[PDB]
């Protein structure tokens, strides 16, 4: 609305500056953005309060940035905070008061809660509201009557239409409450599972659980925790908390195996009580209460096998007290989201290390699952030592002239290969590998295109890993890498970042990436976040290097791809050249070698 | 024309002006205190000597170490013609005025005795409005003499007759300089433009020295009041009070410390975001020169340092050095704790963006090709090298290029060489 002679939005006509603004560490913008002095004496209280009421945008070292959202406001009401309570404390923290536009915005979002609640009973879904009249106006659109099946008033809703109705309810300004009173529920039988005292719960984990379990009723939503932060333990703890039949869904069979191990590792539950409903393996799922499977299995669009149909019908008919969803960034997919309509679950908890995707469907998680129940501050976890200090870097590999000549000439998809394969990027990786290998550092090499992966790994005489590599060959390489001292690096394709349980490594070199996507970048970095046998956070023991070809599309993709990491606070140090690479003996030391590779690169046709 | 120190101006002085400039009231004190730590001793020693001494004595009075500094200081004082070898006898006017300066050799009704804080605040205020006029402010203080001064100072240029003056490449660089350095360049340009416009530099410059401790002086003094460097309650008062800025004068950041003795306010985040705890729009205008401003609060502004805003600044003429300096000199107390104060990623990115802007170095030149022999080619090359006219050479490829001006000399030589036939 108001803009100065400069592009900055100004709010002098919108809010005043309080008398003790120097003591107050926060500002409230009329557009919903919020800033917080991380160095302020009350930062601790303000951080908790802003994580409770707002959505974090950036959390750098000196000033954090947040924005208000209906979902974040609903979460605030979900922990019992009244409009006056958040307003009074926000005004007290705000050094420039609260703009009336935000105050009235908060009013609407606060009063629009508690009015309508969705609950399921006897495999039937009922929409309840305390006020009886609200239903009459809320039903004024036939989409609800067609969705509706043919005090505390309620009506039953057609299961298949719940997704459409729930999304409408948001833009209809009447969100559905999803608190599940697992404590006062005798209809769904409890399960004999508890967290064994061997399990250790960290403060951030405890915070996320406390925020999810704001009362005796579990709240649905998404918890964002790094893979190294023990997201699996939180999920297992939530199941142990709900004490009712629960369904865990992983994005891969490897994850399903990981979950089984974690459940046995952290809970009193026995192996027979856990089943891994999977096409590749059978555990007689109907024989036990805890089930584990994948979106590909349940979400399967084609004809089901007769045996798998037996379990699925049993799964369909049973009601799940808790539905744990891992790597929910995939959930908004057209097929994966169908799982939410197929399975009947009282409360659904989503977990993921990278709640980002290149499509505008991430926001669906707010209605498909719920608001962000928690989102760890990765810098705080490093400061607390829970995550390894990773000195990220971007090596600006200069492209070779004969490569650039072709790269600039070829505008088709073939340039992705040419910018991925050049002597300088190759020599740089070989040099960094040799250096870290002679430094006795475990190194993981990452790539996308198999052609470059092969030609690099073969020229480096190192074992690569990719899709068609059988599980036996694949794991045998990991065991050698982990244990054999003579091997210290592995060349992994997307298989390593998509979904896997790779052994932790001190160093990671990414020579190729699918694009400027944030998701894959943070998934790759996640592999090195694991704490080592004797490291310390100030040691800067972990490393992460992105190899990019200067003056190429890789530069655009790389900067675009790092957005999520810089938002979390990571410093991508640019490396123009590495001292010693001029004298170290490396491949492509003569133009004929470059020409030979370039010729074969062109032969790719 | 980045005249970063007095020494450049000192060299720009002839004996016919030095002798007059070497007045007893202030020049001797100002010059002497500005001489190197070594030469000050010898000048004071020979203040009582009427007979010259050989350079060997000065040389042997200094160790082999520091002899270069003695030679350099000797070069300055000999360049200043303070003495003559006559074989280092001081100039009589210099010796006499230095002698009188040690002891010296005027009063009236009391003044308003305004408080020193008030004087320095309006002085800073006066300099600020000068900068507000210098920047693209929609409204600012103006004056025909101030405008033409900044224009003749090469800081501003008028694009169209009647349109407000705009900033030059030097002007943008100048705007980011620290107040003392920024004021220095202005003082230097005023002095140069003063002699150019007929104001006797001797009198006004000697007056500047006096302030650091005739109608021409009155006119000049009026400008100093308009610059806020001196206080005069009313144009009728024959007495004025020099402000802190005028007292500092040519002392530079080495005297009484740099302008860094001020509250820092810029915060720089690793995401290129800026937070400057400021209300003074001048700082905002400067920040806007190289960063995209996002939000403005009563006491702080939020901005981001992007490729667009920085490369635009670089294209306008700014340098990453000035930007990094402007930030570092304004860095907020909170970020002073980290070392370096600025985040390395930010500093490296800014430098890398400017270095990208000049990836291609363009140089005018004339290229000769098809040299019939390597001998005459190398002979002509040796002449081009001897003339310093060579721009680039590749003897293996038998080629060289030379500056267009220098080309006329090789063109003449080539014709001369060819006309030997």
């Amino acid at each position: 609305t108001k803009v100065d002679e400069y592009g900055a939005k100004d709010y002098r006509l919108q809010m005043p500056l309080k008398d003790d603004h120097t003591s107050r560490p926060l500002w409230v913008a009329p557009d919903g953005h919020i800033f917080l002095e991380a160095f302020s004496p009350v930062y601790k209280y303000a951080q908790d309060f802003l994580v409770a009421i707002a959505e974090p945008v950036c959390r750098p070292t000196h000033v954090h940035e947040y924005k208000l959202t209906a979902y974040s406001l609903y979460a605030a009401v979900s922990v019992g905070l009244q409009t006056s309570d958040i307003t009074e404390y926000l005004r007290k923290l705000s050094k420039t008061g609260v703009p009336d536009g935000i105050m009235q915005f908060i009013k609407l979002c606060t009063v629009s809660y508690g009015k309508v609640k969705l609950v399921l009973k006897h495999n039937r879904y009922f929409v309840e509201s305390c006020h009886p009249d609200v239903i009459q106006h809320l039903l004024q659109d036939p989409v609800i009557r067609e969705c509706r099946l043919r005090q505390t008033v309620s009506f039953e809703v057609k299961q298949e239409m719940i997704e459409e109705l729930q999304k409408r309810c948001i833009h209809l300004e009447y969100p559905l409450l999803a608190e599940y009173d697992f404590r006062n529920d005798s209809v769904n039988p409890d399960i004999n599972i508890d967290l064994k005292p061997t399990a250790v719960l960290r403060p951030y984990q405890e915070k996320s659980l406390r925020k999810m379990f704001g009362n005796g009723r579990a709240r649905s939503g998404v918890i964002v925790l790094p893979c190294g932060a023990g997201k699996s333990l939180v999920g297992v703890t939530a199941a142990c908390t709900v004490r009712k039949r629960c369904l865990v869904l992983g994005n891969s069979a490897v994850s399903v195996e990981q979950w089984k191990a974690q459940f046995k590792m952290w809970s009193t539950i026995d192996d027979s009580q856990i089943c891994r409903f999977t096409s590749d393996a059978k555990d007689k799922p109907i024989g036990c209460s805890v089930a584990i499977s994948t979106y590909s299995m349940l979400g399967h669009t084609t004809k089901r096998s007769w045996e798998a149909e037996r379990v699925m019908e049993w799964l369909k008919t049973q009601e799940w007290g808790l539905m744990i969803l891992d790597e929910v960034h995939t959930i908004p997919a057209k097929m994966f989201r169908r799982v939410l309509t197929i399975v009947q679950a009282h409360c659904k908890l989503g977990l993921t290390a990278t709640l980002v995707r290149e499509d505008d469907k991430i926001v669906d998680l707010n209605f498909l699952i719920g608001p962000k129940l928690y989102e760890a501050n990765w810098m705080e976890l490093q400061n607390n030592g829970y995550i390894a200090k990773v000195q990220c870097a971007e090596v600006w590999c200069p492209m070779s002239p004969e490569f650039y000549r072709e790269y600039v000439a070829i505008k088709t998809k073939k340039r992705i290969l040419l910018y991925t394969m050049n002597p300088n990027k190759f020599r740089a990786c070989q040099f960094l590998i040799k250096f870290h290998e002679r430094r006795n550092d475990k190194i993981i090499v990452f790539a996308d295109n198999v052609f470059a992966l092969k030609e690099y790994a073969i020229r480096l005489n190192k074992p690569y890993i990719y899709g068609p590599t059988s599980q036996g060959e694949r794991m045998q390489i990991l065991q050698n890498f982990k244990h054999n001292p003579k091997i210290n690096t592995i060349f992994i394709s997307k298989v390593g970042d998509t979904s896997f349980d790779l052994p932790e490594a001190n160093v990671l070199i990414q020579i190729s990436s699918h694009g400027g996507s944030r998701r894959q970048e943070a998934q790759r970095l996640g592999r090195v976040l694991r704490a080592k046998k004797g490291m310390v956070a100030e040691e800067y023991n972990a490393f992460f290097y992105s190899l990019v070809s200067q003056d190429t599309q890789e530069m655009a993709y790389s900067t675009k791809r790092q957005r999520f990491l810089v938002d979390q606070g990571y410093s991508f140090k640019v490396i123009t050249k590495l001292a010693g690479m001029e004298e170290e003996d490396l491949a492509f030391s003569t133009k004929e070698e470059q020409q030979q590779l370039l010729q074969k690169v062109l032969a790719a046709t | 024309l980045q005249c970063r120190n007095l020494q450049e101006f000192l060299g720009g002085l002839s004996p016919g002006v030095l002798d007059r400039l070497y007045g007893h009231p202030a020049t001797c004190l100002a010059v002497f205190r500005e001489l190197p730590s070594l030469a000050k001793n010898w000048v004071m020693r020979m203040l009582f000597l009427e007979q010259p001494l050989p350079q060997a004595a000065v040389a042997l009075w200094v160790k082999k170490e520091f002899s270069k500094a003695q030679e350099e200081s000797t070069g300055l004082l000999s360049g200043l013609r303070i003495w003559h070898t006559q074989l280092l006898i001081l100039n009589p006017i210099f010796r006499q005025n230095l002698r009188i300066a040690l002891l010296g050799g005027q009063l009236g009704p009391d003044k308003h005795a305004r408080d020193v804080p008030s004087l320095d605040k309006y002085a800073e205020e006066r300099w600020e409005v000068v900068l507000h006029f210098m920047v693209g402010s929609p409204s600012a203080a103006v004056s025909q003499d101030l405008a033409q001064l900044l224009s003749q100072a090469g800081l501003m240029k008028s694009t169209e007759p009647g349109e407000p003056p705009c900033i030059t490449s030097a002007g943008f660089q100048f705007l980011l300089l620290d107040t003392p350095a920024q004021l220095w360049y202005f003082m230097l340009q005023y002095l140069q433009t003063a002699q150019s416009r007929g104001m006797d530099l001797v009198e006004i410059l000697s007056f500047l020295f006096q302030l650091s401790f005739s109608d021409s002086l009155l006119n000049f003094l009026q400008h100093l009041r308009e610059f806020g460097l001196v206080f005069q309650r009313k144009r009728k008062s024959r007495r004025y009070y020099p402000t802190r800025l005028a007292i500092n004068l040519s002392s530079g950041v080495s005297g009484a410390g740099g302008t860094v003795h001020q509250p820092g306010f810029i915060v720089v985040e690793t995401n290129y975001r800026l937070y400057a705890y400021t209300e003074s729009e001048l700082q905002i205008a400067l920040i806007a020169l190289f960063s995209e401003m996002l939000y403005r609060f009563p006491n702080m502004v939020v901005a981001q340092v992007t490729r667009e805003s920085v490369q635009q600044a670089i294209a306008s003429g700014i340098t990453a050095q000035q930007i990094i300096h402007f930030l570092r000199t304004r860095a907020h107390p909170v970020m002073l704790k980290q070392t370096p104060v600025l985040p390395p990623t930010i500093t490296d990115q800014i430098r890398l963006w400017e270095l990208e802007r000049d990836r291609l170095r363009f140089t005018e030149g004339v290229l000769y090709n098809q040299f019939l022999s390597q001998v005459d080619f190398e002979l002509l090359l040796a002449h081009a090298r001897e003339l310093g006219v060579l721009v680039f050479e590749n003897s293996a490829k038998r080629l060289m290029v030379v500056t267009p001006a220098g080309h006329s000399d090789v063109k003449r030589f080539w014709k001369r060489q060819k006309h030997s036939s």
């Binding site: 000195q391 800067y540 490393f543 123009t576 590495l578 | 990453a320 490296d348 430098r351 270095l355």
Partner: peptide, 15 residues
């Protein structure tokens, strides 16, 4: 032991 390399110790940009 295990000290940071030079390329991570200092600015590699020419400035």
């Amino acid at each position: 032991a295990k000290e940071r390399p030079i390329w991570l110790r200092e600015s590699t940009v020419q400035g």
